[PDB]
Symmetry: C3
């Protein structure tokens, strides 16, 4: 026969399983994979923020005030011409009684350029007097005075001046505060003190007085101070620091830096949370917040030596949390510490069923967006695994439908599983498969008649005459299948009174009736069955998100204070220099 093997359904061809081809078998007894197993670890999670508030402590301020008024007796009239005020500090010989028993000496002495000035209340004798309270606006501040009334009696002889002078003792009790570098502190009344509040424990002080330009500093040991309930059951001794600036004395009780302040504070605690491991990081889940916190794969070393000041709090918080779960869970592993990109610190303790970034970010939105994405992702990936084993259990039945169809005739199954024409035959329980041979398009002609030379026999398919490539002798058969040449003839039972056919070729159809040919008609004129099932899936669609604000930048400005400092200081400078000042003309 001819050389070229068939590769499409368009050329005329001769097929036969007449040779020892390749053998195939239906591989029955398949199975789909089983359901996977998935696991996770529970534990206690504690979350730490970096601290932000200033340090806050109580202080006392001691002063003596000298005042001088100039008055003019005049005649039938009198006036104040001036009033001057001079504050000064208080020495330790007096602070003793002034904080013990609320007494002071009604007079003062002031060295200036090496000469001694003196001031005495109402020009009377140096004598001891008692301090008493005065009313206040703000409940955290208390104030005590020795003499509420300024002296301005005009005097007895007409036409000349006199000077009137007074002395006060003052105590104030109030708050003071300071921030991260601890170089200085600021008092509630606005006094700025320029000494570190821990300075004795940093060994920057002594019982012998220290000195600086504009300061003297000392520590007094076993000092005692009495509350104005003024009662003999005196408070316990302390060590107290004393600062003697120009214009006042100030004092506070000594304390250590590492007991006073620690850099971190507890934000929240979750007694049930889960750890999952990814390619580059760990994820820790907090359901009550709707958030997840991530961290690098390596825990932070030395969190017992750096931040050692937390060792009071993590132990009691883990011990209380473990005692709450002790009926259902028991600890595993050991305590671990992690630092989140974003600036938070995590404490973790694994549980089993019993059966750096100093710029801490203020906005936590990325922790909630991670929780939403990690709830969508496994919810979608579970549908893909449930869809894929429902598909595989169908392909195991399709392979049995093709097996039962193959026992009827195996050729029509092989040219359905392959995309190309082949011929096939059973040789036992295995199927032998074989190539098919092309025949030339020009030797092929189809006969115009179907009734036989016998009186009552009719061909069910039209006769065809042909020859192979590179040959002279002719051959004949019947037009079979799509465009096949069949070598063995077949017939209808009788040439019954009426008959019709529409034989189909690759392009055209031949129409026959009364056992003879009539016309050639295009195949597209015959209507075609549709057996397909439509999906009509609708795809996800685009959204543009918007920038939104609850309060305007102006409303955020006006809410910050009732004071308008930007205009308050501009008017004070304009008034005191241009309007009210001495001015040339």
């Amino acid at each position: 026969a001819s050389g070229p093997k068939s590769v499409d359904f368009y050329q005329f061809r001769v097929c036969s399983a007449s040779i020892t081809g390749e053998l195939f078998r239906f591989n029955l007894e398949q199975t789909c994979p089983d359901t996977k197993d998935k696991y996770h670890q529970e534990g206690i999670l504690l979350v730490y923020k970096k601290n932000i508030v200033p340090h806050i402590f109580k202080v006392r301020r001691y002063r003596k005030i000298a005042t001088s008024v100039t008055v003019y007796r005049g005649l039938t009239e009198s006036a104040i011409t001036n009033k001057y005020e001079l504050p000064r500090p208080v020495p330790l010989y007096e602070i003793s009684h002034m904080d013990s028993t609320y007494q002071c000496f009604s007079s003062m002495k002031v060295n200036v350029n090496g000469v001694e000035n003196t001031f005495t209340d109402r020009d009377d004798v140096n004598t001891t007097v008692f301090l008493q309270p005065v009313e206040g606006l703000t409940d955290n501040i208390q104030r005590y005075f020795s003499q509420p009334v300024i002296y301005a009696e005009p005097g007895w002889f007409p036409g000349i001046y006199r000077v009137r002078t007074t002395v006060n003792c003052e105590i104030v009790d109030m708050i003071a505060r300071s921030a991260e570098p601890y170089n200085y502190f600021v008092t509630s009344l606005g006094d700025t003190v320029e000494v570190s509040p821990f300075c004795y424990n940093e060994s920057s002080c002594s019982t012998t007085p220290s000195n600086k330009n504009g300061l003297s500093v000392q520590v007094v040991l076993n000092h005692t101070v009495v509350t104005y309930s003024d009662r003999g059951t005196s408070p316990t001794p302390q060590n107290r620091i004393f600062v003697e600036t120009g214009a006042y004395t100030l004092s506070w009780a000594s304390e250590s830096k590492t007991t006073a302040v620690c850099p971190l504070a507890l934000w929240k605690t979750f007694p049930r949370s889960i750890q999952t491991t990814h390619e580059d990081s760990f994820h820790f889940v907090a359901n009550e917040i709707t958030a997840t916190f991530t961290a690098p794969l390596t825990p932070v070393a030395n969190f017992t030596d750096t931040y050692s000041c937390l060792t009071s709090d993590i132990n009691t918080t883990l011990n209380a949390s473990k005692a709450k779960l002790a009926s259902t869970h028991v600890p595993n592993g050991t305590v671990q510490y992690f630092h989140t990109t974003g600036g938070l610190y995590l404490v973790w303790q694994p549980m089993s069923a019993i059966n750096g970034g100093g710029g801490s970010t203020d906005n936590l939105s990325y922790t909630q967006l991670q929780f939403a994405y990690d709830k969508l992702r496994p919810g979608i990936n579970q549908v893909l695994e449930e869809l894929s084993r429902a598909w595989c259990r169908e392909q195991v039945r399709d392979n049995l439908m093709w097996y039962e169809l193959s026992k009827i005739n195996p050729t029509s199954v092989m040219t359905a599983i392959y995309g190309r024409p082949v011929s096939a035959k059973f040789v036992g329980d295995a199927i032998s498969v074989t190539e098919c041979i092309n025949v030339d398009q020009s030797s092929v002609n189809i006969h115009k008649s179907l009734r036989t030379n016998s009186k009552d026999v009719c061909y069910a398919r039209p006769l065809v005459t042909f020859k192979f490539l590179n040959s002279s002798n002719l051959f004949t058969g019947q037009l079979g299948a799509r465009n096949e040449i069949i070598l063995t003839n077949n017939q209808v039972e009788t040439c019954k009174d009426t008959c019709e056919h529409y034989f189909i070729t690759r392009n055209e159809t031949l129409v026959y009736k009364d056992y003879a040919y009539l016309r050639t008609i295009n195949t597209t004129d015959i209507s075609t069955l549709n057996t397909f099932i439509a999906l009509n899936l609708s795809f996800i669609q685009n959204i543009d998100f918007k920038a939104i604000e609850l309060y305007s930048s102006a409303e955020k400005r006006l809410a910050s204070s009732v004071f308008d400092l930007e205009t308050m200081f501009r008017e004070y400078n304009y008034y005191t220099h241009r309007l009210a000042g001495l001015r040339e003309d």
Copy 2:
């Protein structure tokens, strides 16, 4: 026959539908479910923020200023030695003319410790004088003066001092402001007044003067004030409050708290929005913002009595919104009020087609994340419903393919629908199904030949000899199907010149040709057809989100003011106490 029933395809067995087994029927005329119906309610949504700005009102301040300068005539030279200033309040006998006609009395009297001081401009006679404007830096502040020039003429006789004195009247017109507890207010020039701005309507005042330490307070009825356009068409009478602190008099017009301020403000309004009900909450949708607001299932009671001050605004806003939709929608139900976790208040009005949390959260990101999640979720759940009815319409056709295959032989369909060997037979329009019986593995032997004792008949399957368990007599048949024993023989039409077979057993294959046995070969040597269609689905993948900031914490600090208050007050204290002050040595 033997007792044990077949449970796999590996042991040799005898099957027959020779007994009255159970009956089965193909249940034709199935259907898939129909498409569901889904519904939602439209309405108008108004959203309220808690208010944040201070209260703002106009005030007047009245003062008299006495000044005294000391000058020294000297000889061939002269200098100022001192300048002192004394502000005082203004009494009602003068405020009358001073706010009516812009006049004041050019002199003042000052009681101190029970004696009367007097100050007069340039030592001249007590006389009436007119106030006039002066220029200002800030456009909200106006200032008026009676005498712009301070007096410092040195005098005529050498070598002795003199005192020069002046008196001013001042008015200032300006803003003042106050915040949430309303205990006090602060003036634009920095004066703090320590009285509540509504105090007469709270019955904390009277027409008889009230008193406090450092204050006097009074209400004046039917008071009148004239604008500096100074024109006879005088403004309408008012009730005005007067405060007389040390150093000034201050006044403002009386007003009621419930007309002055209300705690909430309207943020946005949506004329088309949708309500959906979930297991624990309601969700309200705003498309123009790309956001959704949630609330508890119970509306807030008494929002007409608490927040009654909004009853002017919600009525006109709902009436305008309803009139905008009146061509396509008509109201249903009644107005309802809800409080969102996050601190916003919602107003809702249902429409039909015609056919607490005082910590208000500043960042609205959770409202946009809820809108994105509620756009993904129903978009994915719609694909699952469209995929599930496309699958069911295919299973209704697979059930018809198995029916048409069963009419050819029902055994091969029953052992495809069940996972196990059984035998089956039609008894009418119903199929009778029956168990199959195991035979021992040791009595089975397969014959080495296929040609019969007849001269031209050949067996299509090899002969087998066997016996049942607990028996002596032998039996024979043909090797059928996978590993079956068949009791009725079958043959090929003729012993044609050439023949070949590859019979398959559970492990091994037997090869025969020329109608006799030759070899045993492993089944895995025969190539197997693959008819499966691959899915190749690709799963969703992990993303790590990052912390991001547009401006540094330092840039947010430097943007807050041009004033550097942290260093401005430190230098003023250092200069006035250490550098410039009187200092001992």
Copy 3:
């Protein structure tokens, strides 16, 4: 025959392909669509923020201070009665030497109301003296003085006063700053200057002095200033501005507005980013941030003329970025500029493989939420395209299973592809299809027996007698299929000893055995096969997101300063007016 065509399987009917009906063909040689192609453009992206920091520059302040002290010699005692201070500006004849060589004239003259006052240090002669440094608290401020010590020696004769007077020269070197409208500037020590810092380049100044109420302003050309290293290699000349307010002289070096400040600053640069086009906008992607920025479809015009001050920076940044990619990419198109809703500006440069909104939003969360949504959406839409071509390749095999089943008998395939009974016949390679005819329910009766009048022939289906609508003559056949009447009879091979049947009708079943009828039984008593495969898909579920804060509104307040301005100014007003002031009684 009767008129009504069959529309269900419930009525009895007669079917035959006895007429020339419509022709159908199996449309083989189908294909599914091929895989789509998808494309995107890479480029360099630069992102610009609006600037927020104030302008910052160096200044000098020059002063002369006159002081006067009053002291009383007295007897056996002495005291200070007053101390007064008077600051004044410095004239250009002196600023020359004072900034060149650090010298000043130890005396001053002060015009007031047209008469000249004079002050001289310690009453000594007018002489030149040298300035020297003093220590400072804050490292950005330097201060120089001519006389550190105030003079207060009491004097020699008992019982009378004397006045002591001193003069200082002061220089201060420090920072000053100003903001967006540029109307004024504020010095580090709190001095507010009320002149624009660029005023000479805006032609608001001259070398002839300008004047305002309370100011004089001048520009000095080629001025020179010497650093206190005080060395003959003098710095280069400048043009310097001079302001002469009351109480001081102040100076700064002249500069142009367009070189000093530009409104925008570079935030980040991405050398690989991608542009995608949507229905109304463009999206630009930044992977290292996990964010995408959107913009309108039209680029902004005139960004080379408005914001021309950026032309130094975008050129060098694009040139450096292009040189980094020059081994793998080459430029295409040209540079384009876009303005994002949210207030950022984008610069874009396309690359190829070689082979307005002044309210800038501070919170970028919407840019990360867009990146998450645009990672979910194409990840889900890819699964729908991979699922849809896996479905289509199966429907192309189902169409071949129906073709092979149709060659056995075409009726049972046509009533599976249609939902209704029809009859069909092959007329060649095409199938002729025909309607079926209803018969009345009352003429139908089923015979009680199956054995024939012949001695050993039995009917496989029971006999039926019937007639057509509007007729008298009777007909007979066999009960076939579901509820069909068949006109041609068929039989079992022999009336074998035992036989049983369960014939099924639309409601009831008839049971027969020993070739005769016995009972009528409901069809539901016969057990039915189940061949369906379950999906068990589980749908996505609802989540309620929460409002979260890292720091309380109180902690955000307390972190803003160590100063408590809200109480500091309230106590100063209470103390100086009520407690310490002159008060009537």
